[PDB]
Design a protein around this ligand. Structure first.
Ligand SMILES: [Zn+2]
Lengths: 48, 47, 74, 104, 122, 134, 121
RNA sequence: GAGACCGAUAGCGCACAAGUAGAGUGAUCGAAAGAUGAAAAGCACUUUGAAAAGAGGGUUAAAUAGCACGUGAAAUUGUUGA
RNA sequence: UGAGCCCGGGUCGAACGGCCUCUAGUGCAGAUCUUGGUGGUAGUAGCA
RNA sequence: AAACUUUCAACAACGGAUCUCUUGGUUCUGGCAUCGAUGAAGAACGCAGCGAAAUGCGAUAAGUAAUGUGAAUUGCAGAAUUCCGUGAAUCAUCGAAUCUUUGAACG
């Protein structure tokens, strides 16, 4: 297939509708994020 | 012959001929002093 | 004084000896005009005055230059 | 306008005068007389590199690349997480490549 | 609005004048001279300045000011007679005295608590 | 969304026309709504305001105040309602300007021209309502 | 002191002129007695002048209509009564001369006129 | 009819009684200058003052918005405090 | 580190911001810079 | 100690910067083609109840006729409109008129 969680992460690592970026850190607004940090580990919409 | 007028006092920032009655006049300034020094340096380099 | 009242243009520009207006050239039928002075051209171009008749022409063109009266009038 | 800043008559006063070597409006009976003009740094003067209508407003893009991008956009629209990432509230609708009945 | 906003308006009388065609420097000097004085003493002093009996000391704006023995009243050498500013200040003090009479204060025990001169549009 | 090319969506032209319109266009703009009883009586929503109407001010500081129109001042887009006045410094009463959009017409001044206006508006509304219904 | 345009349209020359003469006399008298206590008399004089304009307009219109009926079947018209249009339109070729065509062209158009035809798909 | 344009030192010289005021014998040269408030409701009346104006009082949500009026920086200035 | 960024208090009244890309008339201490405003000189020279 | 000079603060001044606005400008696109001896463009003098400028008009002079809408104008004063009307309006439309001195300008 042409689509994988790696592909979604690489496409969406820089910009998301959930991504909050400030000087002290980058957070996540995703409801499927257990930590509210932007990472491949905790990207709920990215990981299968 | 040609007189020299320093653009200070009543002669500073004047559109035309000052009150000095003469056939030919030339206004002078420090900017012209620096330009003339540059021209003399160029002439000396040429010679 | 070398410039009096010109009747055609209204300026104090009539050389009394030459009898020629310096602005419009009254004795000449043509009004003095030069392409090297766009500012003077736009000072004395049409639209800077009263527009007595040329202002009323366009309405007649829009309605077709028709003549007569509306039916059932007076 | 191509005539913006050019509709004045100014000339430099000279070199030996204690004033900036800038064109100045002639006259003598108005505030505008003697003021600098024709410069990008002067009030009511020209602007540097005036904007012109020939700017390459449109961009030529290869049709093959246009079609490639359209195909990639279609695939992305098929992908479900990308919809949420773009910002569509897609939680109450199933089958992301959503099809409604033509008769409906 | 007034600069001195720490004084209650029910216990004080206020006077104001704007766009007064009198010299700002002379008016500042005479206002500083009469600052903090009783109303009667200030009025008598201003009338004396009009009558060339007492002189206003010029402290800040006193470049090349003529000397006069009256300056010994202030321990200074440069004193002047700013007559027109004295008249303007007399008018304003009379307005303030009238305001105090209207409010019901005792005019016999008023002091010039605040006085200020600012520049107007030229 | 605008479709016809004759229509302009430009703020500059819209405001210029609104603030430079002549008296007839101003009347059309100062049209005002009718009360509910008049709505089910005439099948008409809004009509241009005039001098002889009785209205109810329902917007503004004057909450629910009824009164007869005294004068319509088309220049600044206001109408004057009877007994809706304020005292000046001298105590002289001056009218308060209320917008026809803020008033609602309770009693309508009846004349042949306005009856014809109502007839035309009602005829158009009922024709289109019948077309939509069947 | 206001005359009605419609009323003035049903009146003969003497009628219009007698009222106009009375109207000018009234204007003169009202001006003379208005120069003192110019008030509602000023308003009446303004209305009176408007009435003068109305009477003059109606007389002129009636006279011009009579002149047009007189010149209805005459080839030359007065320049005032002639239509204005513009200079170019007045100098333009008349419709009949512009539409006039040569006899050979007329014969060709008569015997071979543009036909209607369709081409199938 | 519009604009990935400019936004009162910008955009046409002119957003204003601008080719106006004004200057030149003349050809010609040619400006500056927008904003109270939702509504003038633009401060009744008293007192001082010759007047200008000030102090009370008043309108307003606000006069810390008074037709020297949206907001009101810097340079520069006055008073008070250290 | 920094260019800068964020908050509190006062004023104020009608729009504005963060993030990813795009775009440009995008960053000032000088240019005897342009325009405007204001200083010391100075209550001085001076007002025949 | 005070005065004078300087620094910081609060308040008050001068000034119009900043923010916000915009019946203005600039650029592009589309439909159409219409000045004048039937006296043009332009210049001048007049006309309003109270007007200096701008605007309109021309001794019928902030205007007339006619047509449509249908109850105003407005800073003040004075008249309206009967409203069940050929009829207010600094209204719109516009086919009839008036149009002083000149200006291609023509005894
Ligand atoms: Zn001439």
């Amino acid at each position: 297939s042409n689509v994988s969680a790696d592909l979604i992460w690489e496409v969406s690592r820089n910009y998301n509708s959930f991504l909050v970026k400030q000087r002290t850190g980058t957070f996540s607004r995703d409801a499927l994020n257990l930590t509210n940090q932007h990472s491949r580990k905790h990207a709920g919409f990215v990981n299968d | 012959q040609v007189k020299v007028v320093k653009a200070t006092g009543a002669n500073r920032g004047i559109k035309g001929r000052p009150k000095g009655v003469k056939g030919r006049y030339k206004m002078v300034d420090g900017r012209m002093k620096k330009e003339m020094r540059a021209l003399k340096r160029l002439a000396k380099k040429k010679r | 004084k070398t410039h009096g009242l010109c009747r055609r243009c209204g300026r104090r520009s009539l050389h009394n000896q030459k009898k020629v207006c310096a602005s419009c050239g009254y004795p000449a039928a043509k009004t003095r005009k030069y392409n090297w002075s766009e500012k003077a051209k736009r000072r004395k171009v049409t639209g800077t005055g009263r527009m007595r008749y040329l202002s009323t022409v366009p309405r007649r063109f829009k309605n077709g230059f028709r003549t007569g009266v509306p039916k059932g009038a007076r | 306008s191509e005539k913006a800043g050019h509709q004045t008559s100014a000339e430099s006063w000279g070199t030996g005068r204690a004033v900036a070597r800038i064109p100045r409006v002639s006259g003598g009976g108005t505030h505008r007389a003697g003021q600098g003009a024709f410069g990008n740094m002067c009030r009511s003067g020209r602007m540097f590199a005036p904007t012109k209508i020939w700017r390459k407003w449109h961009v030529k893009i290869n049709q093959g690349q246009k079609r490639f991008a359209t195909a990639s956009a279609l695939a992305a629209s098929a992908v479900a997480p990308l919809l949420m990432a773009r910002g569509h509230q897609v939680s109450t609708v199933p089958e992301v490549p959503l099809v409604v009945d033509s008769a409906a | 609005r007034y600069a001195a906003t720490e004084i209650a308006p029910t216990k004080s009388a206020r006077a104001r004048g704007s766009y007064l065609r009198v010299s700002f420097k002379n008016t500042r000097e005479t206002a500083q001279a009469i600052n903090g004085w009783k109303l009667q003493r200030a009025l008598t002093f201003l009338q004396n300045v009009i009558d060339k009996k007492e002189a206003v000391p010029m402290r800040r704006y006193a470049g090349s000011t003529g000397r006069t023995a009256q300056g010994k009243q202030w321990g200074v050498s440069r004193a002047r007679w700013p007559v027109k500013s004295a008249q303007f200040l007399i008018g304003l003090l009379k307005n303030a005295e009238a305001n105090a009479d209207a409010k019901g204060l005792d005019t016999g025990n008023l002091i010039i608590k605040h006085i200020q001169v600012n520049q107007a549009p030229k | 969304m605008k479709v016809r090319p004759t229509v302009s969506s430009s703020r500059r032209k819209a405001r210029k026309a609104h603030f430079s319109a002549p008296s007839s266009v101003r009347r059309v703009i100062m049209s005002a709504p009718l009360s509910k009883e008049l709505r089910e009586k005439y099948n008409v929503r809004s009509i241009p305001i005039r001098k002889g109407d009785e209205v109810q001010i329902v917007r503004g500081a004057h909450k629910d105040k009824e009164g007869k129109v005294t004068s319509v001042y088309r220049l600044k887009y206001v109408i004057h309602v009877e007994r809706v006045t304020r005292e000046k410094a001298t105590g002289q009463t001056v009218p308060i300007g209320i917008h026809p959009s803020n008033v609602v017409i309770t009693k309508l001044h009846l004349d042949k021209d306005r009856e014809n206006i109502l007839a035309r508006i009602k005829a158009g509304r009922e024709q289109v309502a019948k077309a939509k219904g069947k | 002191g206001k005359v009605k345009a419609g009323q003035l349209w049903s009146k003969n020359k003497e009628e219009l002129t007698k009222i106009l003469g009375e109207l000018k006399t009234e204007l003169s008298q009202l001006r003379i007695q208005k120069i003192s206590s110019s008030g509602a008399k000023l308003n009446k004089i303004h209305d009176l002048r408007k009435s003068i304009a109305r009477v003059l307009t109606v007389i002129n219109a009636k006279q011009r209509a009579q002149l047009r009926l007189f010149y209805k079947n005459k080839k030359y018209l007065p320049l005032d009564l002639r239509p204005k249009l513009t200079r170019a339109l007045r100098r333009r070729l008349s419709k009949e001369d512009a539409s006039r065509v040569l006899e050979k062209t007329k014969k060709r158009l008569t015997h071979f006129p543009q036909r209607k035809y369709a081409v199938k798909a």
